[PDB]
RNA sequence: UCAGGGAACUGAAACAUCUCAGUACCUGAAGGAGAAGAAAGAGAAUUCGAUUCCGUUAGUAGCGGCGAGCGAACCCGGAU
RNA sequence: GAAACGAUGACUGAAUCCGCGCGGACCACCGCGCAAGGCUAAAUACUCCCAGUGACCGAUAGCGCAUAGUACCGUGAGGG
RNA sequence: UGUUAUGGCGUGCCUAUUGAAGCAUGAGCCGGCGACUUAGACCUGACGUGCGAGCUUAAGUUGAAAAACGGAGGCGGAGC
RNA sequence: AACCGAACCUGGAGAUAGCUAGUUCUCCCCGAAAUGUAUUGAGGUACAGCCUCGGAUGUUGACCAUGUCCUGUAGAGCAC
RNA sequence: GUAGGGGAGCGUUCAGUCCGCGGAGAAGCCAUACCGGAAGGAGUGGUGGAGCCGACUGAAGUGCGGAUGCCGGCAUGAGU
RNA sequence: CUUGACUGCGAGACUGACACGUCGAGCAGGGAGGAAACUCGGGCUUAGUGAACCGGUGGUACCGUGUGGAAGGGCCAUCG
């Protein structure tokens, strides 16, 4: 919704959606190196079908 | 009632637990959300005639350092 | 990776002049003062690095 | 004769009516019949829990003009300053930007607003002169 | 008392007579069971990974120990 | 129409901020209409030039248990 | 909230033209403006009422009423 | 075509259900009333139509048995 | 003021109702699900799984045989 | 073949055209053995006394056995 | 003997509705051990854990509302 556009819903030029990586963000952290750098790219398509209709109009 | 202008016309009232933090707190956050009211007081004076009725006390300080359409 | 009371601790980490956190986890028990371990900063990287703070 | 005159052929159908049909009884058996809160979204599934900010800004925004565009057709009627609205960058709003898409060799003289390095490096190695504002 | 039945999942992934692809897991175990021919690497969990493409080897001992191999397909 | 006073059910799938909403209702004053007005202003061109109204900017800037949700103004096109 | 500015309830309480208010903490530049006095049709809103029309009803519809707030209910407000 | 005698066959309807002739709901009978709608310059898709790398107007103006004008703006056109 | 663990009337107000009941004209073609995971979740909901329509692809489907490997049940056995 | 999806259509009010019919009698109501794959549609006969089919297109307050559904009317319990 | 309990990355697969989760050859800045092939991005593996949000802390210099700065915000760490 109109929160959610700073935050990555993002929508791409396929129409697709950008949504990467969560494992740690802030909290809780102190393992490995790349788990840290774990935070990605990435997306499904699965719920990104019902995902823009929340950034809908605002691409 | 007051002198020049009126009286009472209040608001809500507000209070907040977290009162305070590190300034940098982690948040301030709400209880109160009540509606409040506000007065003054009375003394008595007269002009154009013997009267009593009410004194703004910024009206006082007024129509005591000066006479503006009044006098004590 | 909970904190508490507890013994050993999570201590954070710098560099000569470089500026780089490890952030790793030791230990208080059989031995912690010296931090001391060699670790690679922003540019230079090669450099020891003294954890204790 | 408008007695005469035709359907669109196929352009409706028409609507849909619930009552009769003869064993409709509509939409789900329980729960999701009646109400107006269906709503697909909302903060509960997988929306937040997801891990961004990031800020917003948008700031200046220019014109794509394509140089395949420019090039190609057309005269090279020494685009400038006026005569562009006429081809097709229309936005007002904002100023105007030249980007290399196509090739072809033409002597051009235009006038925008910036470019892009391989545009200008484009433009003058056909010959030609491409204006900025000082 | 009781509690947890676990998910787990193991198996062997990619079985003998089988084309694989650089970097596919071909087997999925807990100690060493299958260990590593030629062809093949070992992660630290002792998962048998593909190093190049080829086709899969299986070789048999009388267990104990026995072999994931990858020979060249081409 | 302006003004003094001002809810709750409800939404947030519970509920305190929040939303419902300055909604309902009470009250006060006035007319055929009211309100509003002749920049200590919008605004970033050293432009615009009283107010109201419509379009549009725009669900955009932004507000928010940054949750549910709420949501402008300048420019520009007008009626006058 | 970094909360500017308008607005007052209580304490306070400056300048006046080599001056004062603003420009979203604040500072300096740089602009925009000159508060503490008032009135001001028009374009806007509404329909007790009159006129005209309608892919509006036509007697279980259409206003409650092809007239009745009557009969009838209630102490009453009210319902009808 | 109407009525009939005899033979064979034959567990109302609806709803709710794992399962209904059900000794589970509903309903005296017949009229008549009675339930998937409307809205927004919204979002997405299917079909159809006009122009087509272009496509369109809104408020409003003017004629109004009749509709034209009105390019403010919107959508394509470049992405990360 | 003939039903008071908060009177009555009008109103907000078509309060909400994950609950119950009902939802009418025909034929034709297909055709399910009551499983998995999460849920202040457990008669509720999101995603998946299973249904249909349209487009694209175009045998990849299905069974059955041959080849190839993987498994430790039934049986059995007593070598831990 | 149940939810569900897809396809063709029937009937009803209104509207625009088209064709027409009606006091030697309209719609409506009554009966009826005919027509059509269904929704349904005609033929004639009886009622009626002022209006109305058919075709095409468009718009719907458009189709009832249920809701302890609503207004009405009339039954059963009974000559108790 | 040492700080590979590394930094910038991921060919390709296991697994999950999703979000997570898991293994991993190899490119580079670079390191440590070995004479050398070479090994090392924690620990024989399998448990030793927790999304977002709001905030504390070090680093970087993108945003910063007329302009130059700052407040505040952003990104890379990271603590609760
Ligand atoms: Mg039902
Ligand atoms: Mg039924
Ligand atoms: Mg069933
Ligand atoms: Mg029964
Ligand atoms: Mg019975
Ligand atoms: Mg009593
Ligand atoms: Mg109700
Ligand atoms: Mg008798
Ligand atoms: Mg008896
Ligand atoms: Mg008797």
Same mark, same amino acid.
């Given at each position: 919704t109109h929160k959610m556009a700073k935050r990555r819903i993002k929508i791409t030029g396929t129409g697709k959606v950008m949504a990467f990586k969560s494992?740690?963000?802030?909290?809780n952290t102190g393992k490995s190196g790349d788990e840290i750098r774990g935070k990605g790219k990435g997306f499904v398509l699965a719920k990104a079908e019902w995902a823009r209709m929340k950034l809908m109009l605002p691409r | 009632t007051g002198k020049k202008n009126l009286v009472v016309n209040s608001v809500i009232r507000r209070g907040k637990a977290r009162?305070?933090?590190?300034?940098?707190?982690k948040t301030t956050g709400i209880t109160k959300r009540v509606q409040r009211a506000n007065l003054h007081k009375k003394a008595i004076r007269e002009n154009g005639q013997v009267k009593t009725v009410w004194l703004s006390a910024n009206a006082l300080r007024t129509l005591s350092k000066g006479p503006y359409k009044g006098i004590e | 990776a909970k904190d508490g009371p507890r013994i050993i601790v999570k201590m954070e980490s710098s560099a000569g002049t470089g500026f780089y956190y490890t952030t790793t986890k030791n230990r208080r028990?059989?031995?912690?003062k010296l931090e001391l371990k060699k670790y690679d900063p922003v540019?230079?990287?090669?450099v020891v690095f003294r954890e204790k703070k | 004769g408008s007695r005469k005159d035709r359907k669109r052929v196929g352009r409706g159908p028409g609507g849909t009516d $619930? /009552?009769?049909?003869?064993?409709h009884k509509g939409?789900? @058996?329980?729960?999701?019949? %009646? $109400?107006?809160?269906?709503?697909? %979204? %909302?903060? @509960?599934?997988?929306?937040?829990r997801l891990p961004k900010r990031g800020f917003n800004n948008v700031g200046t925004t220019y014109e794509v003009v394509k140089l395949s565009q420019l090039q190609?057709?057309?005269? /090279? /009627?020494?685009?400038?300053? /006026?005569l562009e609205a006429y081809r097709l960058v229309?936005?007002?709003?904002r100023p105007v930007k030249l980007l290399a898409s196509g090739e072809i060799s033409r002597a051009v003289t235009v006038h925008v607003d910036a470019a892009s390095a391989a545009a200008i490096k484009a433009v003058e190695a056909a010959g030609g002169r491409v204006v900025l504002p000082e | 008392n009781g509690r947890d039945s676990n998910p787990k999942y193991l198996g062997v992934k990619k079985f003998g007579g089988e084309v694989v692809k650089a970097?596919?897991?071909?087997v999925r175990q807990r100690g060493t069971k299958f260990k590593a021919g030629q062809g093949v690497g070992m992660g630290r969990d002792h998962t048998l990974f593909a190093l190049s493409d080829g086709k899969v080897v299986f070789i048999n001992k009388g267990k104990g120990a026995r072999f994931i191999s990858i020979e060249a397909a081409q």
């Open positions: 494992g740690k963000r802030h909290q | 009162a305070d933090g590190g300034v940098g707190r | 028990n059989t031995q912690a540019a230079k990287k090669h | $619930k /009552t009769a049909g003869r064993g939409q789900k @058996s329980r729960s999701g019949a %009646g $109400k107006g809160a269906f709503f697909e %979204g %909302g903060r @509960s599934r997988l929306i937040a190609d057709l057309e005269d /090279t /009627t020494f685009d400038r300053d /006026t229309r936005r007002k709003n | 970097g596919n897991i071909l």
